[PDB]
Symmetry: C3
Amino acid sequence: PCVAKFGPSPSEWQMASSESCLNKMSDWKLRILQNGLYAIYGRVTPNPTYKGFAPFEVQLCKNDAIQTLTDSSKIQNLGNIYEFNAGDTIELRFNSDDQVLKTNTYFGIILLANP
Amino acid sequence: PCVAKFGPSPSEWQMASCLNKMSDWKLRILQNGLYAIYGRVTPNPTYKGFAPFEVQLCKNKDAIQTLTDSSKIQNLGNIYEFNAGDTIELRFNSDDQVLKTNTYFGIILLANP
Amino acid sequence: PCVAKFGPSPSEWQMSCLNKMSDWKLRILQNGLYAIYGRVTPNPTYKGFAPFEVQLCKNKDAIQTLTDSSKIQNLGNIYEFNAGDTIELRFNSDDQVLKTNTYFGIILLANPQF
Ligand SMILES: [Mg+2]
């Protein structure tokens, strides 16, 4: 049962696994250590009162954005399923940290299977 | 597996814990965990009512999925974190908006660390 | 683990609960909840007559339809399938995709007994 989750604030990385399918590298960024099928989950809650000159863009990145969010008027789900390979780096990136509400913004991942 | 599925008509609740059926289309989550939702929503071509087409999967009273295109047969497959005490329900602006024989939803626990 | 994966080219099938029938097409032999995953990449120099359209079909029913030709698209999802069901990834024209970066896979997650 290999599962990891970053957020929401004030929480950082939580993790449970055997000995393990991933490695946490830094905030919002992990490293896949086992080829297999994974599920991503989580929530991006945009900041309504963002007062910055940068365009709202949240991306989930595989090394390649595999999920791009450009609508700052909607709370967005990150739930999905992907095949990843050992070595891959998974990262949730924000064009500015102030674009999202970090107290209601998290993402996680779980190994579903390894063919 | 901890699994529950409602519909399609004439089937009601089927179950194989982590949840408790509350009524038609509505469930109570009993454990914090990671869940997969699956299912399909088929608009009813015979609908002539005056309420706009809308179907929503609500966690508690908040929509986590919203369907407004009455010309789409939409899949409900997704992954979510739910907590104990959450209710999950599929709601319709009108029962006559969907073909009940072709509309169902299910949920399975993936893990609950 | 009951898995099958077609592609990407030149790979075809990599691999009971299912039977592979043809390129991009398989026969579900067992009831269950299945996860689909994969990727569809449009061919940016397609100039055929058919409108772009790629579909995951269960029997006669497109469970997923893609009509956006400007972006690579992910196929990840969970569906309930039944013994007998066929599953195929079909293209309105094979020129519409770059087979070198188009593939799909499936795996049985559970087969609950209600
Ligand atoms: Mg061949």
